[PDB]
Write a protein that binds this ligand. Sequence first.
Ligand SMILES: Nc1ncnc2c1ncn2[C@@H]1O[C@H](COP(=O)(O)OP(=O)(O)OC[C@H]2O[C@@H](O)[C@H](O)[C@@H]2O)[C@@H](O)[C@H]1O
Ligand SMILES: Nc1ncnc2c1ncn2[C@@H]1O[C@H](COP(=O)(O)OP(=O)(O)OC[C@H]2O[C@@H](O)[C@H](O)[C@@H]2O)[C@@H](O)[C@H]1O
Ligand code: NA
Ligand code: NA
Lengths: 249, 249
Amino acid sequence: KMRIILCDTNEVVTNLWQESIPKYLCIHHGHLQSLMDSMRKGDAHSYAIVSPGNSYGYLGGGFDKALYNYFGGKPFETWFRNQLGGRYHTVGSATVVDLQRCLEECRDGIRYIIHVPTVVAPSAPIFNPQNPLKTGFEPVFNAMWNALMHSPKDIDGLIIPGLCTGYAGVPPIISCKSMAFALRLYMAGDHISKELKNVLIMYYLQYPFEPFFPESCKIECQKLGIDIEMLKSFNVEKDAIELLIPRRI
Amino acid sequence: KMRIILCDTNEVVTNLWQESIPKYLCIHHGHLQSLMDSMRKGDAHSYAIVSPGNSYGYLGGGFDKALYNYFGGKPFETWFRNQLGGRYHTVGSATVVDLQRCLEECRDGIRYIIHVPTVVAPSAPIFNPQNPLKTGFEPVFNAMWNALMHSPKDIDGLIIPGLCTGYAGVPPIISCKSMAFALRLYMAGDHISKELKNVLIMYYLQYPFEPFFPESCKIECQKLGIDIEMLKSFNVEKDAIELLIPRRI
Ligand SMILES: Nc1ncnc2c1ncn2[C@@H]1O[C@H](COP(=O)(O)OP(=O)(O)OC[C@H]2O[C@@H](O)[C@H](O)[C@@H]2O)[C@@H](O)[C@H]1O
Ligand SMILES: Nc1ncnc2c1ncn2[C@@H]1O[C@H](COP(=O)(O)OP(=O)(O)OC[C@H]2O[C@@H](O)[C@H](O)[C@@H]2O)[C@@H](O)[C@H]1O
Ligand code: NA
Ligand code: NA
């Protein structure tokens, strides 16, 4: 129903998206601006744009900069930061900014910006090859999961760029995988219970805590064709997402 | 106006709280249960309890366990998890659960539980001495900041235990410092602009990004008696919070 548009100027990101994801979803290699211009020859449709930002709402670089240019520059940034309460928002949070208030700056079919801080400030990458899990796989998944969970149900399409793949410095190979996983859970709809999705996330993030693996979910894995042994030993650095969410689903 | 009650069974945590914090705030060494029993000889008052939990809302250990016992055990946990949508909530998020619905389980003057996930699951500590900042100072500050920002404005008191100091495995000496800082910013009220607080957080977390340090905040530091040089070089492991928020304020 809701179209998901993955947009990014880095072909490495777009190529990786093509590989890890099975209409309902579209991939666009190129600038957001052009995708927007391109978004004027179809409906002759309201969207929300996920933007990986900083904890303060400044839009001085990366994807945020495209948003800054496209929506009115420095007055828009000023307005934007005020919508966020002008204060610190933690990485792990997500805030929807309604552009409808433009009527009090309006443009195209974009009504929302889902602000998801990926860095406190771009003073240094968040990534550390010593632990690609805590500084890569996990933060990207969380940012994607929150953006999806916060997506207004009234929109026609959701525009999302690579997350943490710019100033945050997370390798695309790592980010794309977590984005693909979050999206795969979301697209599984009700074919997988919420509880089982919770369990799949827990093992994907390598937190093998048995007490949080209910028997009902074990029965559901057997019914869905998910190998429980491989689930309990899922290694985010070597195993395919398919082992958690079979495409047959 | 709003009373803040720091409660914890670990005397190391309570002792450290005494040292890093200057009525409006109370410290209680002891079990939450007894503080609640104690909370019946004063008003002859509605509170909110901050609870450091996991991403799934299970209440099987630590402070959450006290909540589990006190509010109805396994039916309460079941109800609690449903209030959270029965799904994954990221570390960095905060969700207020209204116990008012008890009338459809009601007890004392507690109306809210501010659920702040500090771990995905208690399968291992989140702390790593290799980087006490990214795995200690920062996550504790974020959890405290969010709990405070999410505190309902209608409550009389806010009950908070040590955050990340149990199953998360963050040393009290580190956690208490970040909790003290978050609380010091909050208690500074309007005596410090929101923007300056943003800057103090940024440097406290060691993200020295100059472009995010507005000139107006520099002028405000000079006016408030804050040494800008020491701000730009604040070292969370060696410098006193006082250097960021002078007690004279
Ligand atoms: N105009 C654009 N169009 C499409 N994609 C873009 C554009 N500009 C950047 N991108 C892509 O968007 C992705 C996101 O990178 P960033 O914007 O840098 O975000 P990430 O979390 O790394 O970093 C966010 C941080 O960087 C700051 O610019 C931003 O304010 C925030 O503090 C990258 O894969 C990048 O190639
Ligand atoms: N009954 C109690 N009364 C007062 N303080 C208590 C009590 N039980 C524990 N505490 C204190 O509360 C603090 C919080 O520790 P945890 O509850 O373990 O929480 P922290 O983030 O480490 O870990 C949360 C994680 O542990 C799990 O139990 C919980 O569900 C979550 O997954 C500690 O300083 C601990 O001494
Ligand atoms: Na950005
Ligand atoms: Na707890």
